[PDB]
Amino acid sequence: GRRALIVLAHSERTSFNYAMKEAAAAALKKKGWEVVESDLYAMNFNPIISRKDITGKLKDPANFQYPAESVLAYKEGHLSPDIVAEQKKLEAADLVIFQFPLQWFGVPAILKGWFERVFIGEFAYTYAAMYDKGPFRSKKAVLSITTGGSGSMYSLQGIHGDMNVILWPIQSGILHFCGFQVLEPQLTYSIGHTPADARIQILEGWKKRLENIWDETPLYFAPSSLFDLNFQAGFLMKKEVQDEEKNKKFGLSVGHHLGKSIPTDNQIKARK
Amino acid sequence: MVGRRALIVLAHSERTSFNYAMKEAAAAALKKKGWEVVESDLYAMNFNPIISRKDITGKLKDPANFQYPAESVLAYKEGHLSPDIVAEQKKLEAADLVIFQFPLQWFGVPAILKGWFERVFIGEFAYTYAAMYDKGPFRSKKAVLSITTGGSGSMYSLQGIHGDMNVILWPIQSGILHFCGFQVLEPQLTYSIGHTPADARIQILEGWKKRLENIWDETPLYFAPSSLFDLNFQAGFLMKKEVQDEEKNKKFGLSVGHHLGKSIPTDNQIKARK
Numbered sequence: 075g076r077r078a079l080i081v082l083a084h085s086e087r088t089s090f091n092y093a094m095k096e097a098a099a100a101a102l103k104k105k106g107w108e109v110v111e112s113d114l115y116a117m118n119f120n121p122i123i124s125r126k127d128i129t130g131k132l133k134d135p136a137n138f139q140y141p142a143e144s145v146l147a148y149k150e151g152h153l154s155p156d157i158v159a160e161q162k163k164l165e166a167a168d169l170v171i172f173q174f175p176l177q178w179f180g181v182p183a184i185l186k187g188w189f190e191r192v193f194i195g196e197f198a199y200t201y202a203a204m205y206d207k208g209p210f211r212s213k214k215a216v217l218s219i220t221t222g223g224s225g226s227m228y229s230l231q232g233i234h235g236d237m238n239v240i241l242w243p244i245q246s247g248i249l250h251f252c253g254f255q256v257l258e259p260q261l262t263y264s265i266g267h268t269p270a271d272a273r274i275q276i277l278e279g280w281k282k283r284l285e286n287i288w289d290e291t292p293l294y295f296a297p298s299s300l301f302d303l304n305f306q307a308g309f310l311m312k313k314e315v316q317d318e319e320k321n322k323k324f325g326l327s328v329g330h331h332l333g334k335s336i337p338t339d340n341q342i343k344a345r346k
Numbered sequence: 347m348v349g350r351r352a353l354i355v356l357a358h359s360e361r362t363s364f365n366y367a368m369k370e371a372a373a374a375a376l377k378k379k380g381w382e383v384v385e386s387d388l389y390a391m392n393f394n395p396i397i398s399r400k401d402i403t404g405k406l407k408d409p410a411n412f413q414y415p416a417e418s419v420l421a422y423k424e425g426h427l428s429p430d431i432v433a434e435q436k437k438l439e440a441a442d443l444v445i446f447q448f449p450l451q452w453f454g455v456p457a458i459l460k461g462w463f464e465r466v467f468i469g470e471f472a473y474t475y476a477a478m479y480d481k482g483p484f485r486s487k488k489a490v491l492s493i494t495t496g497g498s499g500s501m502y503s504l505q506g507i508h509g510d511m512n513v514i515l516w517p518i519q520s521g522i523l524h525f526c527g528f529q530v531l532e533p534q535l536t537y538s539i540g541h542t543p544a545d546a547r548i549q550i551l552e553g554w555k556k557r558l559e560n561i562w563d564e565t566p567l568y569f570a571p572s573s574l575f576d577l578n579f580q581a582g583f584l585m586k587k588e589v590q591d592e593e594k595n596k597k598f599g600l601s602v603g604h605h606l607g608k609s610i611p612t613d614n615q616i617k618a619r620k
């Protein structure tokens with residue numbers, strides 16, 4: 075009796091992105107999951123943060139500050155109802171799947187805005203509850219991404235550079251920041267040169283994976299306990315941990331590379 | 347630098363914001379040195395950040411299987427792009443220097459600016475598969491990010507909780523700007539602006555204005571040149587074997603994205619080297 079939310083960011087029902095979403099819904103239902111959807115284009119979701127996101131009375135309409143105002147509105151219950159409806163789907167969900175095409179080395183604008191409007195302070199993060207101590211630490215998230223370019227272009231030696239660096243801002247900075255356990259991304263390269271028969275196998279592989287998704291070991295991020303979590307220490311790594319890491323050849327993660335070598339496929343493969 | 351044109355793109359809804367103050371400072375300083383300055387204030391324009399069919403005003407090649415990249419390109423060549431897009435494209439064509447002023451939001455650009463990239467940077471106009479990176483169409487132009495953050499600089503140091511800022515900037519500076527040919531200059535990073543006392547804020551504006559007086563003479567950031575790579579589908583756009591052999595013995599990689607499994611050159615995306 076577990077709940078999945080699927081967030082889709084593609085305008086076209088004829089797209090492979092849409093096929094992947096449908097495959098995911100079908101596979102999860104068959105294993106007895108409840109499945110909810112946020113198909114952002116079909117919903118005409120508004121991706122722009124603004125004053126209109128607060129329906130009540132602004133604390134300071136002369137010097138409007140979205141982070142402070144949005145948080146008050148969350149606590150006092152005057153957030154725009156489109157936001158609240160999305161927040162409730164998240165609260166209920168155990169597993170969150172994000173299905174989208176890579177666009178300009180990141181998430182589509184409409185999905186970026188969903189994060190901006192929905193992941194409000196106090197709901198999705200606090201100063202005290204970041205990263206592995208975040209509110210969504212009981213939940214799991216996975217990115218399912220399609221690219222036009224081939225895998226070689228995003229290898230260590232490819233023209234675009236390491237895919238692991240491209241995913242880091244999203245998987246660390248958005249998902250893990252709010253507490254999500256992040257699973258290995260589903261990467262579908264060069265979808266535009268892939269014939270129908272192959273596409274069907276890929277969907278079959280996706281469906282097969284989703285049968286056991288909940289058992290998978292997540293990606294590694296540096297635990298928050300390695301850091302001094304307060305304003306005076308500057309949220310720096312503890313001195314003792316610095317001393318223990320001095321002599322190692324590899325860094326901890328893509329973002330915590332510490333000037334050394336980045337552990338291989340830190341953002342693509344779990345250590346297991 | 348007289349005779350030269352700057353475009354300033356702003357992504358902030360509030361005229362009372364420090365972001366807006368930074369834009370105004372930039373406009374003032376550039377005009378005083380005789381630049382022509384054009385603005386795209388995306389919130390003031392109510393810019394539509396969502397790609398759709400309505401971006402093509404003519405006839406779709408294939409309405410049954412709609413694919414934005416193919417359709418947008420045809421529309422660019424045949425001249426039936428939505429005119430809001432074209433007006434932005436014309437500002438870009440004319441501009442020598444592009445400044446992007448925005449607050450960091452979820453470790454990147456605001457959605458409204460992300461959409462501007464998606465709607466404006468159309469194939470053939472801003473990139474081709476033959477003209478990528480340093481061979482791209484905008485290779486005569488310079489771009490600079492000016493970013494404000496809520497969190498402090500320590501949080502984005504090598505040992506900070508959020509991790510190296512260099513990694514955060516890479517997808518934007520390499521993947522969007524340099525991909526289209528821009529020479530990318532050192533970013534202007536303004537940390538913890540909300541907890542900065544007034545007198546410091548004033549110095550920051552003054553420093554920004556002083557920098558802009560000689561911005562055109564600055565050395566750009568280092569990205570691996572395209573000439574290190576076999577640019578064709580059979581080679582897989584991999585680095586040439588000979589270049590791999592020359593790099594085998596070095597301790598540092600080439601860039602954040604081209605770290606090659608080794609150490610990342612210090613402040614690759616924050617500081618230029620000469």
Ligand SMILES: Cc1cc2nc3c(=O)[nH]c(=O)nc-3n(C[C@H](O)[C@H](O)[C@H](O)COP(=O)(O)OP(=O)(O)OC[C@H]3O[C@@H](n4cnc5c(N)ncnc54)[C@H](O)[C@@H]3O)c2cc1C
Pocket residue numbers: 084086088089090091092093175176177178179180220221222223265266270271273274277397411412413414415464465
């Ligand atoms: C603004 C923008 C920026 C971009 N930036 C990048 C970038 O930075 N990097 C990059 O690599 N790419 C980039 N791209 C390319 C983009 O990532 C691809 O267009 C995307 O991955 C394509 O997937 P799709 O779902 O749109 O498939 P489509 O091309 O829309 O569909 C593929 C085919 O699969 C078929 N299909 C659908 N369902 C099934 C099924 N069940 N069985 C069999 N066949 C089926 C469809 O009918 C169609 O023929 C960008 C594109 C845009 C528009």
Ligand SMILES: Cc1cc2nc3c(=O)[nH]c(=O)nc-3n(C[C@H](O)[C@H](O)[C@H](O)COP(=O)(O)OP(=O)(O)OC[C@H]3O[C@@H](n4cnc5c(N)ncnc54)[C@H](O)[C@@H]3O)c2cc1C
Pocket residue numbers: 123137139140141190191358360362363364365366367448449450451452453454494495496497498539540544547548
């Ligand atoms: C959705 C969202 C996501 C975010 N994600 C992140 C994140 O990932 N990382 C992060 O670090 N931060 C993040 N933030 C915080 C964000 O980066 C800051 O709120 C923003 O950078 C502050 O800039 P501002 O221009 O809005 O500040 P404001 O609060 O508008 O301005 C700061 C101060 O400058 C004063 N000021 C205005 N004009 C002048 C002037 N002319 N001279 C002097 N002082 C002046 C203002 O009155 C105020 O005191 C996020 C915020 C949002 C809304």
